[PDB]
Design a protein around this nucleic acid. Structure first.
Lengths: 799, 799
DNA sequence: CAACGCATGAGCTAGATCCG
DNA sequence: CAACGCATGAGCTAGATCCG
């Protein structure tokens, strides 16, 4: 037979060898097999136990913390395939922290459908590299076999298997010292094979009896049907867990077995696409008689039979199933004890609930203020009741002030009784208008819901306050609202301004409860104003707040305060919030004005936007000034040690950019650059303070040097006067001429004529002149640097 | 007469000149006279009033924001002296933005006691350079008269006063065009004077009618007594404001005038060393009848008779003017109807009171978790009783959780009845506890304290719980306590465990009236234990907690929990709080290791205490490493552009300090400095990671330059070889020799010899040396900088 | 009779319908 | 018979007398 044995559910084994005895006649195990934590076991009570008739594995096998095993092949001698239907710990088969196992001996395994193997912290195993996972494990890139006895080549590795050359070496792969890993010709990869190499039926695997037969081999691929198995059997039967196809009359009765809410390992199995699947996916709803899934027109419920029909919920873990679980056949109970933030998690998990049939109970609430997370709820059937016939319950909750927004919500109760006791944070108004929309109208207990233990410590109010005038500056906001007096005007404590910035308008609404929050609305108290007894008076109260960054959206309102007294009046008033931004003074200074000059006529200035823009800046205002050189540097003797070498005003309204280039300016001249960041211009023209920077553009290559006829006059005392021309537009200013003369065969003897010396003499002179042929050359050394050399003027003075 | 007028208290004028009329007959002003805020005033209402009787000033005279005064001389024609008792922002007399004032007219000031004059922003004043303040103001170094009408010399400045030459100019000092500044001969600087210049009595000032008489002049220096004044008056009278002396019967009445707490600007005047000082200084306490300040052995009270023997301090302020009060002579009623946070403020405000005489009524508390703020209360006398002879009263307190810790507290009530009603979360044992510790044992009412309306809505558990073996680690503590079972061991819910760290032991008990505060005892619930039906069993339950910090004290206790029931039984049990500190470990890293170099052989290093000590750190472990220079810099041609210029291993157990210097080290080398903060050492020697910094000390003055016999060898080709020696201990390293040779009549031409060139040649050569007398001088330029120059070695090479 | 004048704008003097 | 062994120590496997 393919599988002549019996079905066998997955099961867990710990702390005893007693509960393994339930594997006497099992052949195929659905689920997984976990056996672990086995310390006080003599090793020799394992040699006399085995499970030969067990073949198939669906999910996984695990071995962890065993004291006494040496070779599990004595217990698992015919095991061939792991289906790997579920990945556990991102792995399939794991042997961890073994203490006594010498050799593995899984000599019968052929294929791993899905998953990976992992053997760790086992300093007693050998032949771990004689495995060839690639043949068995279709995916090897995740195999993790480290920190074992094979950390050092010290365990033998001797065995009598073709010794494949899958790697670069002629490695021999064996299971034990008495078992190799059988390999036949690979004409068929995963379709079963014989010892003689003859391939068996394509749709079966493992060891084989007769080739090309899907009925007498061992294990097959797709499904199973009564000694046969085909890729897809005809739909008189429906497929089950990708391993069978059997008639729905059986799994319908399985659905009827634990439809009694007794165990949570069950699933409300449903037929869909000829699959008795646990749940037909989203966008589908259930039917009563035909056991199919209707495509669920709209976001309709699917369904969900509550645990024990009375299950309580205390955390998100106790509400994980609610995703998809929409119609509830039980009584819900909620009690969060502590918690940090669940108001953003319930909607993603239970914001899709519409119908419950039991009764709802709330107690010991700590960190909740509303019931808005209950989005799609519409009705409670109340087939089961609390003691005293209560369809709803609410005791000892000290933080709830809100249930639903009944201007847009609708709930109905079929029957039962309401409970509201010791909920001191919710006014009588809400629960009375709970009764308006709820099914009950006069069904009260007497003593019904507590009328004194609830809402006593928090004074509810249904009164509003409106504003009268608002003025804003860039930094200060002028607030003013209408006056108000309580029915007893002396009974009044003042006003509080709760205010902060709000870049959006999705701001949290005020609830009157103080939790441990770092972020809180800064608030100031306002002295109640003088009583004027005049309707036409200055009784309108207000306040001016000044510590505000400009152009930020601020949410503001004002809340009254009055003492609590015996009479249930003077509830005060509460003003709704409004949004206000500031005014638009001149922005802050422009930041980082960077000036760069690359050529003699180009200067680029780039800045950074002002730190405080004070609104949308319309433009930028730039200004430049042509600086002047020093007049003190004209009268220095520049052949003495020490020489210098440096590197209305027109404007534009530069807009919509961050840099500006200015040309048509004097070359090699200092330029003081200033820019004012400036807001909207035509009304109330005000700009920032100018960020001042200095800039000097590049000099000109020819400006330093001067060309012209350098003439000479020879005096009688052999003192030759020299006449030439100065640079009309030098690079900054001429400071020194590098005048020099040369005899043929004589070096460049240079002389000095100062800027003033050239000015007073209109040239220079060469006293004590040797008779001969001299060439006079002049270099115009500007403060920007030395210029070019003039033409060496030839003149011969003879003996 | 000397001082024939009337005493006149300091007074202020604003927005109306009406109240100035109270200066009709007072000639001496105590305090200060402020005149300010006069906008809508015609200038014509001023020439009809004057004050020819007032002379002296104590604090300061201030004229500010007046619209219409052009000459204040029409109001102050005779006053001459100002004492400046209290500095007005470190000044004495100010005119500050006066708009109508043409001429000041202070033609009568004689002398300045202390302070400064300041005249500002007056574009209508002249003659301000004609004052000669140096003759009247004792301290000129702080005069500030800027930005006035005489910022420009444009107002005339003519006057008919000897034209003093105090400065380098013949400055003519005049007050007005009709009055100059009067100066008589300076034989006596401040001993009074007449028009003819002869000096009057030594102890008086300014004007004078008959000379050399303390009774026949106008104003004197030290004191005053019935038309006379002496340096120290006889002690039948006692000095007042160091300018009079009056009988004790006078200022005892001043003490008794505002012993009635009506105005807070006065003081309870006391006598000390012939001074009716407002308060005898710290460490001195008054006596009742004598009004003398006892030397106050040890701490002494300020004493606080309650206002009208009855007060209802309820809020933050209430009667906040009571800091320092210790004993109260009335009765108090406290009621904080809400509030934000006062727990951290009462101790600094009222946390020093010990005794009250009346009764205490407490009601409507909302944020009062305990009464530990009443730190020093010891006894209640009960002079006034509430209706029904009630001394203690508690009513409708939803957050008064606890009263006191009697193990470290003692309170006694002499008489009266105690009231405690409708406080629904405070149990029955502690009110018995305060009953037994207090005087009363059987003074009850029928009905006395409510036995049901209190502690019913909270699971009060005061019944006994004791712990068992406890175990602790560096991070975790193992807990276990004695088993408890209610009289019905079926009615139960389990345990909850509150904990929080505490650097001290003045921690509030968990005490159970729900106050949602920012800081609260974080709690974990416990599954109630199994029933074993054996007294000798494992019934002791425990718990493991891990999220803790090492070396930190933590308070812990356990509490039972049970379902509510109609029967008043199964009250459960509760444990007392205990302290168990966590264990120490390695400290944190040493912080901010700062190394400073002051000499070549001293290197000081200072650090900061580690952030986490983890126990009492016994010492600090320090180490260092001798860094080496870079060997790659030896083969660099330093004459080319680019030069560099910088600025087991032994140890010691540095203890009980923050810095330590290291001596005995080589000159100018880098050092790697590492220091470990470390806890107790001889057992479990564990220290943290070392804080690593670097340090290089300064070089040696002479180590850079080398001295020695610099001999030379002249070759046949006029190429002279140079022989000299290298510095044995260069500062860091020698890198280049600044070799140079200078012929007479020629410049000191410099040549080059590299570090390796000097190595391969043991010197340098001079190729192309013209015949002459040459002086060779070398400067040893190391990486630490240039050394000294050698001697220019004279050698003569001939033609 | 519906911003500015007749200060400044949160540094021992009061606190923006604050004032007209 | 009163820490350690025949794990680790809060990352889908249990939660420190937790197993002797």
């Amino acid at each position: 037979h393919l599988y002549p044995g019996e079905v066998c559910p997955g099961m867990d084994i710990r702390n005893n060898l007693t509960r393994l005895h339930e594997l006497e006649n099992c052949s195929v195990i659905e689920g997984h097999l976990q056996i672990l934590l086995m310390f006080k076991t003599r090793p020799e009570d394992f040699r006399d136990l085995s499970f030969p008739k067990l073949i198939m594995i669906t999910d996984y096998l695990l071995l962890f913390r065993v004291y006494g095993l040496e070779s599990l092949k004595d217990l698992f001698p015919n095991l061939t395939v792991i289906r790997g239907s579920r990945l556990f710990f991102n792995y399939a088969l794991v042997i961890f922290e073994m203490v006594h196992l010498k050799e593995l001996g899984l000599y019968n395994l052929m294929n791993i459908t899905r998953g990976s193997v992992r053997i760790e912290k086992n300093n007693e195993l050998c032949y771990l590299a004689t495995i060839d996972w690639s043949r068995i494990l279709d995916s090897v890139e995740d195999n993790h076999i480290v920190l074992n006895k094979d950390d050092n080549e010290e365990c033998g590795d001797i065995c009598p298997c073709p010794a494949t050359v899958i790697n670069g070496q002629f490695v021999e792969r064996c299971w034990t010292h008495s078992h190799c890993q059988k390999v036949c010709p690979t004409i068929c990869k995963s379709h079963g094979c014989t010892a003689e190499g003859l391939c068996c039926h394509s749709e079966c695997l493992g060891n084989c009896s007769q080739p090309d037969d899907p009925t007498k081999c061992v294990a097959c691929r797709n499904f199973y049907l009564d000694g046969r198995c085909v890729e897809t059997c005809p739909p008189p039967y429906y497929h089950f867990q990708d391993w069978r196809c059997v008639n729905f009359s059986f799994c319908q009765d399985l659905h009827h077995k634990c439809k009694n809410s007794r165990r949570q390992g069950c699933h409300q199995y449903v037929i869909h696409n000829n699959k008795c699947i646990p749940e037909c996916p989203s966008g589908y709803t259930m039917n009563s008689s035909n056991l199919l899934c209707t495509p669920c027109l709209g976001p309709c419920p699917k369904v969900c039979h509550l645990l024990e029909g009375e299950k309580t919920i205390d955390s998100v873990t106790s509400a994980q199933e609610l995703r998809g679980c929409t119609v509830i056949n039980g009584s819900l109970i909620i009690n969060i004890r502590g918690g940090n933030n669940l108001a953003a998690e319930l909607e993603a998990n239970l914001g899709l609930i519409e119908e419950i049939s039991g009764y709802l109970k709330i107690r010991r609430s700590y960190a909740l203020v509303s019931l808005s997370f209950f989005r799609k709820l519409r009705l409670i059937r109340g087939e089961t009741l609390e003691i005293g016939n209560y369809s709803f319950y609410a005791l000892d909750n000290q933080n709830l002030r809100q249930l639903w927004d009944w201007s847009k919500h609708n709930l109905t109760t079929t029957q039962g009784k309401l409970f509201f006791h010791y909920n001191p944070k919710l006014c009588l108004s809400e629960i009375h208008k709970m009764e308006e929309v709820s099914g009950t109208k006069g069904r009260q207990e007497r003593n019904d819901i507590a009328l004194k233990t609830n809402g006593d410590k928090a004074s509810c109010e249904n009164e509003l306050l409106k504003f009268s005038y608002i003025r804003t500056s860039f930094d200060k906001i002028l607030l003013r609202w209408e006056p108000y007096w309580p029915p007893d005007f002396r009974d009044l404590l003042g006003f509080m301004l709760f205010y902060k910035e709000a870049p959006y308008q999705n701001v949290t609404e005020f609830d009157g409860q103080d939790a441990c929050g770092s972020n809180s609305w800064t608030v100031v108290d306002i002295d109640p104003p003088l009583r004027s007894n005049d309707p036409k008076s200055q009784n309108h109260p207000g306040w001016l707040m000044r510590g505000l960054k400009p152009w930020t959206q601020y949410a503001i309102f004002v809340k009254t305060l009055v003492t609590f007294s015996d009479e249930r009046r003077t509830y005060g008033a509460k003003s709704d919030i409004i949004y206000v931004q500031t005014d638009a003074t001149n922005p802050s200074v422009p930041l980082d004005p960077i000036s760069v000059s690359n050529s003699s006529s180009q200067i680029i200035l780039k800045w950074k936007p002002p730190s405080d823009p004070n609104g949308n800046i319309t433009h930028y205002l730039v200004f430049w000034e042509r600086q002047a050189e020093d007049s003190e540097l004209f009268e220095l003797d520049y052949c003495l040690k020490g020489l210098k070498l440096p590197s209305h005003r027109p404007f534009e309204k530069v807009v919509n950019k961050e840099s500006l280039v200015i040309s048509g300016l004097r070359h090699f001249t200092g330029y003081r650059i200033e820019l004012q960041a400036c807001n909207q211009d035509t009304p109330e023209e005000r700009c920032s303070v100018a960020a001042y920077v200095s800039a000097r553009t590049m000099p000109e290559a020819k400006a330093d040097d001067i060309v012209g006829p350098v003439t000479h006059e020879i005096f009688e005392n052999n003192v030759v006067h020299l006449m030439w021309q100065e640079p009309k537009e030098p690079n900054g200013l001429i400071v020194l001429y590098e005048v020099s003369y040369r005899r043929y065969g004589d070096e460049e003897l240079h002389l000095c004529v100062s800027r003033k010396h050239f000015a007073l003499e209109r040239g220079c002179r060469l006293r004590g002149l040797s008779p001969g042929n001299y060439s006079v050359r002049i270099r115009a050394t500007s403060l920007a640097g030395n210029g070019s050399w003039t033409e060496p003027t030839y003149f011969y003075v003879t003996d």
